[PDB]
Design an enzyme around this catalytic site. Structure first.
Site, PDB file in Angstrom:
ATOM      1  N   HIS A  40       0.899  -1.210   0.050  1.00 28.43           N
ATOM      2  CA  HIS A  40      -0.266   0.021  -0.088  1.00 28.43           C
ATOM      3  C   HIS A  40       0.865   0.946  -0.214  1.00 28.43           C
ATOM      4  O   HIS A  40       0.566   2.362   0.287  1.00 28.43           O
ATOM      5  CB  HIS A  40      -1.002   0.316   1.164  1.00 28.43           C
ATOM      6  CG  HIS A  40      -0.673  -0.042   2.832  1.00 28.43           C
ATOM      7  ND1 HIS A  40      -0.289   0.973   3.196  1.00 28.43           N
ATOM      8  CD2 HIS A  40      -0.618  -1.445   3.072  1.00 28.43           C
ATOM      9  CE1 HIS A  40       0.382   0.530   4.136  1.00 28.43           C
ATOM     10  NE2 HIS A  40       0.193  -0.610   4.932  1.00 28.43           N
ATOM     11  N   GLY A 145       1.446   4.454  10.213  1.00 22.03           N
ATOM     12  CA  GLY A 145       2.403   4.867   9.712  1.00 22.03           C
ATOM     13  C   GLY A 145       3.897   4.003  10.485  1.00 22.03           C
ATOM     14  O   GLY A 145       4.930   3.955  10.535  1.00 22.03           O
ATOM     15  N   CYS A 147       3.582   0.777   8.848  1.00 17.89           N
ATOM     16  CA  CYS A 147       3.950   0.144   8.230  1.00 17.89           C
ATOM     17  C   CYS A 147       4.651  -0.506   6.619  1.00 17.89           C
ATOM     18  O   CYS A 147       6.065   0.985   7.104  1.00 17.89           O
ATOM     19  CB  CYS A 147       2.624   0.155   6.918  1.00 17.89           C
ATOM     20  SG  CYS A 147       1.379  -0.323   7.329  1.00 17.89           S
TER      21      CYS A 147
END
Length: 181
Positions: A40, A145, A147
């Site tokens: 993502h 925050g 990932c």
């Protein structure tokens, strides 16, 4: 100490603060010019790495043998020099661990260590309406925050953080075969 020095060395040599159009992420460089991002993050033709813009030569969004998303993007970067090769610390099969540390490294959460506890085989996960396979789970309320964060235990690099639901955190499991030449 041995586990503290291993995590600190990974931070120094392999775990980079990055920015894409989707924001701040942690990025593990694995060997040569190959690094891994959460899918993502959606890297474009350039990615901000620490202090400079780096061209992205290739990006592979990994799927399993049935075509199901694994929530990982493997990037080949136009970097001067090679990452220290950490493939020997990645297991051959997706493996959990006891008492893991999640390592985050972004501008907002630099050099951050999170005690997520035991990491177990989970498998299927519906992440933001994207079905995902080969996940593992930790019973720790991770936040936004994180990932790309690197899940580590006793000299093993086992997963990359891909999200959470307020009580649990989830990683994409790492297999050494993802990084074979």
């Amino acid at each position: 100490g041995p586990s503290l020095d291993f995590a600190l060395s990974l931070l120094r040599r392999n775990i980079r603060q990055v920015q894409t159009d989707q924001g701040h992420f942690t990025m593990l460089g694995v060997r040569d010019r190959l690094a891994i991002l959460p899918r993502h993050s959606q890297p474009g033709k350039t990615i901000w790495v620490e202090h400079k813009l780096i061209n992205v030569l290739d990006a592979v969004e990994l799927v399993d043998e049935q075509g199901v998303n694994l929530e990982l993007t493997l990037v080949t970067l136009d970097t001067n020099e090679k990452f220290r090769d950490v493939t020997k610390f990645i297991p051959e099969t997706i493996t959990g661990a006891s008492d893991a540390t999640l390592i985050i490294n972004t501008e907002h959460m630099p050099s951050m260590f999170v005690p997520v506890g035991d990491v177990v085989q989970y498998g299927f996960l519906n992440l933001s309406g994207k079905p995902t396979h080969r996940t593992m789970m930790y019973n720790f309320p991770t936040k936004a925050g994180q990932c790309g964060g690197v899940v580590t235990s006793v000299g093993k690099i086992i997963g990359i953080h891909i999200g959470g639901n307020g009580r649990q955190g989830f990683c994409a499991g790492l297999k050494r075969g993802y990084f074979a030449s």
